[PDB]
């Protein structure tokens, strides 16, 4: 399946005027558009090559939509500070993301479209598109204001729609890049302690899409509360990266087992050193 | 395409 | 402040000498957004720094990438240094290219 994402994030700054508005769109993990109200001439941008097809008329609308969308937020953080009795002088963040998760023949599997304030989940559509989780009382203000006026049908207009429609758009246009299944090169390293002991490093270079898991057992047993697991991250050339490892006695390396399961692994790997 | 707030605010 | 940033120093490939590669400086986890990133070649703020790849956990944290182009060499010496809310001083990580 694939995704079409967009994450928006709105940041009051008192004292140096207006929030910083953003937003940042994704087809499953690669970025393709952003706008950044601080930009030199604030304007939604392309982030890959194969968004660069669209003409003048995406670039406009969707700049417009960004625009309005900036004024919403603008207001919405006045609003806050009401709902929290929270004082003006200070800087606080409302978040947004917005998208739809698709099978590859067309089928909606997940929409979504949540806001969290200050770091802390706020409001969410639920997965019927027509009724909304409220995470504390102000919350709940929203939802009732948001039922009254119908709010979820427009917006299960547009995951089910354009979310949909354009998502397959862009799978089409960008192929080359975004249909690849790079799986896993996984290996694992051996480092001596000063201790007297050993730590065993399983590395996952080169995949995509960067969905993984990676983790190591004994005996069967998975070693969770013991691995230090570093965040799956870029490596800059549409393909990511992660590692796991933990501490062994020496001359019991080979006891220990690094398991690795990614799309692009139909058997998942289990390595030992 | 990006979502629209439709100026529908919290 | 609610979230403390956690830095990854990393190269594209795996780093030989003399072999040109990109320098990653991953930074992740954190709340709130506001954030400063510079990477340092030998304790001198490198020029050439782009950000990108900004996205949330949700649970909401911040995620983004800063990154430079580089060729590594024996005598260089990389770092990435971040100040963030949610801590009192700049952090400085170093790139460590044998693990
Ligand atoms: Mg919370």
Redesign the interface.
């Given at each position: 399946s694939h995704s079409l994402r967009?994450?928006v994030?709105a940041?009051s700054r008192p004292g140096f005027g207006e929030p910083r508005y953003?937003?940042?769109?994704?087809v499953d993990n690669t970025?393709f558009?952003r706008f950044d109200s601080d930009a030199e001439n604030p304007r939604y941008e392309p982030?890959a090559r194969w968004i660069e097809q669209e003409g003048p008329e995406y670039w406009e609308?969707?700049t417009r939509?960004?625009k309005?969308?900036e004024?919403?937020?603008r207001?919405?953080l006045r609003?806050?500070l009401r709902?929290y009795n929270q004082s003006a002088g200070g800087?606080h963040?409302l978040?947004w993301?917005?998208?739809c998760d698709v099978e590859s023949d067309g089928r909606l599997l997940r929409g979504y479209?949540?806001?969290?304030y200050?770091?802390?989940?706020?409001?969410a559509l639920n997965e019927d598109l027509k009724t909304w989780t409220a995470a504390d009382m102000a919350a709940q203000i929203?939802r009732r204001?948001?039922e009254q006026?119908g709010?979820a049908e427009?917006?299960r207009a547009?995951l089910e729609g354009?979310?949909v429609e354009?998502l397959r758009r862009y799978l089409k246009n960008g192929n080359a890049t975004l249909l690849r299944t790079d799986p896993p090169k996984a290996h694992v390293?051996h480092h001596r302690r000063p201790e007297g002991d050993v730590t065993l490093?399983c590395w996952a270079l080169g995949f995509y899409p960067a969905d993984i898991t990676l983790t190591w057992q004994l005996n069967g047993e998975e070693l969770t509360q013991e691995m230090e697991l570093?965040?799956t991250?870029?490596?800059?050339?549409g393909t990511f990266?992660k590692?796991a490892s933990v501490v062994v006695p020496l001359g019991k390396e080979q006891k220990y087992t690094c398991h690795v399961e990614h799309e692009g692994l139909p058997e998942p790997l289990t390595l030992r050193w | 395409?990006?979502?629209?707030?439709?100026?529908?605010?919290? | 402040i609610?979230?403390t940033p956690?830095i990854?120093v990393?190269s594209?490939?795996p780093p030989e000498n003399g072999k040109p590669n990109?320098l990653?400086c991953?930074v992740?986890?954190f709340?709130?957004?506001?954030i400063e990133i510079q990477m340092l070649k030998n304790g001198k703020k490198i020029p050439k720094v782009e950000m990108?790849?900004?996205?949330?956990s949700?649970?909401?944290?911040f995620?983004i990438?800063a990154?430079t182009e580089f060729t590594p060499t024996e005598t260089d010496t990389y770092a990435c240094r971040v100040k963030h809310a949610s801590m009192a001083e700049p952090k400085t990580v170093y790139w460590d290219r044998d693990?």
């Open positions: 967009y994450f994030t940041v953003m937003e940042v769109g994704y970025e558009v982030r609308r969707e939509r960004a309005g969308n004024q919403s937020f207001v919405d609003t806050a709902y800087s963040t978040q993301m917005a998208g479209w949540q806001f969290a200050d770091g802390c989940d706020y409001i929203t204001k948001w006026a709010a427009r917006d547009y354009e979310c354009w390293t490093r570093v965040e991250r870029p490596a800059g050339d990266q590692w | 395409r990006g979502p629209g707030r439709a100026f529908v605010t919290i | 609610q979230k956690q990854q990393y594209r490939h990109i990653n991953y992740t986890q709340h709130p957004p506001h990108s790849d900004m996205s949330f949700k649970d909401w944290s995620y990438l990154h693990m």
